Structures are given as C-alpha cells and as structure tokens.
Design a protein around this ligand. Structure first.
Ligand SMILES: OC[C@H]1O[C@H](O[C@H]2[C@@H](O)[C@H](O)[C@@H](CO)O[C@@H]2O)[C@@H](O)[C@@H](O)[C@@H]1O
Ligand SMILES: OC[C@H]1O[C@H](O)[C@@H](O)[C@@H](O)[C@@H]1O
Ligand SMILES: OC[C@H]1O[C@H](O)[C@@H](O)[C@@H](O)[C@@H]1O
Ligand SMILES: OC[C@H]1O[C@H](O)[C@@H](O)[C@@H](O)[C@@H]1O
Lengths: 142, 140
C-alpha cells in the first residue's frame, strides 16, 4: 500500500508473520545467532521516540549493526537452512554503504542475496517462531 | 529508481534498459547456459524490443496478458567455459511461474516480490548473459 516495494521473504513458512512496515527510521539491527539465526531486534525512531521490536526466539548471541549518520542498509544476504525439522535462516548478513556485516549463523543451505544497485532498505517483514523463519525488506530510493 | 541485482559475473559489457511503462514479453535464449534475453515493452507511447547478451541457444517466450505482471526472478550463477554467467533463469508472473531456462547449475538466487513488479532490466552481456538485475516499481 501507498507505493511500497517489498522483496522477499526468504526462508520458511513456519512461525508467525510479522510486518514492521516502511514508516520508521532504522537506527540499529541486532541479529541473534548460534547454529542458525534465532531472531532479530530492530530499533527505530519515529517522531522523536525510540522503539525496539523483537522477532524470532530467545536463543543465540547478539551481533549489532548500529547505523551512523549517513549510513544506510544497501544489501542483505544469507542462507535458508533445514534445521531441527524447520526451514529457517541459517545465516544472515547485511551491507551498508560503509561496511559489510556478518553473515551471522553457522548453518548453510540454499543461499540468497540481495544486492541493491540503487536504493536502500527501509523496513522489514518476515516470520518468526523459535528461530527466524523468514525475512524480507521494504525498499526505497537512495 | 529501485534497482536490485545484478546477479552474475563481471565479464561482458554493461547494458541498461531502464524502466518500461509495460513489459509485453520476455524471451529467454538458452542452451547449456542463458545466452541472452529479448524484452518487448511499451515506452512513452512507443512499442520497443531490445536484445541483451548473445544470439545463441533457443528462445523461450513469456507473453504477459492483460493485468499480468512479473513478480519474481530466480536462477543460478554458473561457471561455464571459464566465465561466470547465468546458468539458469526463470520468472514468475502473478498467474504462473516459468522456467528454468538453461541447464548449468551454480549458486542459486531468488527475488520474490511481495509488493511491486519488475519494470525493466540491467546487467552485463557478451557471448552469454553474464549478469542480470531488475528495476522495481510499485503496483498501481
Ligand atoms: O522458528 C522455527 C520453528 O520454531 C518452532 O518449531 C520448532 C518445533 O516446535 C517444531 O516441531 C519443528 C518442526 O516444525 O521446528 C522447530 O524446531 C515453531 O515456532 C515453528 O512454527 C517454527 O517454524
Ligand atoms: O542458533 C540456534 C542455537 O544454536 C546453539 O545451540 C546456541 O548458540 C543457541 O543459543 C542457539 O539458540
Ligand atoms: O547456452 C550455451 C550454448 O549451449 C549449447 O552449446 C547450444 O544450445 C548453444 O546454441 C548455446 O549457445
Ligand atoms: O558473455 C560471456 C563472455 O562472452 C565473451 O567471451 C566476452 O564478451 C566475455 O567478456 C564474456 O564474459
């Protein structure tokens, strides 16, 4: 709606769907991982208020991506894996216009990659349960 | 503009179709790998056809009917005769999925479009289709 562009999600069909929408300003992403991607904390600002939403389960070790001034997410990549009978994100990483982060997680499977030649990530959607079943992104120019 | 990809290698020469008003059809030329693509589309009142990549292989045409649009692209980036090229390519419309076109396996990629559509292409081509990316636009 309202001219959104959503690509993905990559991953499985388990868990519960989530959708952050594209209205907020992402300030940091915290990926929790061990053998696979357990979940993600997305911290954003909106009208001067800072909020964090958690998706996926409670396991794993955190790996934070803190966006500096003038830093944007311009890529996402990873692996879709079969783990404990579930189709989940086995690995997940991101690129900014300054640096590559990760991938985080240690289970291979079917790779995916989202290089963004023109544009940036402006929000997330996906599925979460005990682990991070799936992830997708909203895109916008620059 | 929103441009995602390209997926593929760094050989050949760059191409850029830019976005279209409406894509009419896409022809994927393939054999062992993806040789190239034809795109027929409307543009500021004109009907146009553009060819990218080489002229080898056999064509496979996807015609987009009334109210039909491209909502996915997937394939495999393969190693072939010392080049990194598209080994397989396929597309999904809001009605059906098509492909794979090509026969050489490699590193898979996939672009499901949950909201929006493919409106044009860019990439690299030589004898084969070295790389491919897409322009994305929202749904009307
Ligand atoms: O987030 C992954 C997965 O987690 C939970 O399911 C676990 C287990 O209870 C299931 O029996 C197996 C097989 O489906 O998968 C997991 O290990 C659920 O939240 C599930 O919906 C979700 O896909
Ligand atoms: O990633 C899945 C799982 O992997 C390991 O067993 C640990 O790192 C856990 O904390 C984590 O939940
Ligand atoms: O796809 C690469 C190549 O594969 C085969 O050798 C034939 O189908 C050719 O015409 C084609 O050019
Ligand atoms: O397209 C595959 C291959 O075709 C030709 O040999 C050249 O144009 C290369 O640069 C290119 O990589």
């Amino acid at each position: 709606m309202n001219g959104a562009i959503k690509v993905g999600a990559w991953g499985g069909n388990g868990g519960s769907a989530f959708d952050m929408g594209p209205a907020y300003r992402i300030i940091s992403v915290k990926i929790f991982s061990g053998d696979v991607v357990d979940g993600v904390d997305v911290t954003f600002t909106y009208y001067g208020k800072t909020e964090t939403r958690h998706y996926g389960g409670s396991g794993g070790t955190p790996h934070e991506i803190v966006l500096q001034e003038g830093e944007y997410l311009v890529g996402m990549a990873g692996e879709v894996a079969n783990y404990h009978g579930a189709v989940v994100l086995g690995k997940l990483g991101f690129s900014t216009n300054k640096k590559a982060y990760g991938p985080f997680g240690n289970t291979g499977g079917t790779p995916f990659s989202l290089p963004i030649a023109a544009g940036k990530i402006s929000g997330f959607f996906g599925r979460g349960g005990k682990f991070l079943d799936a992830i997708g992104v909203y895109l916008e120019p620059l």
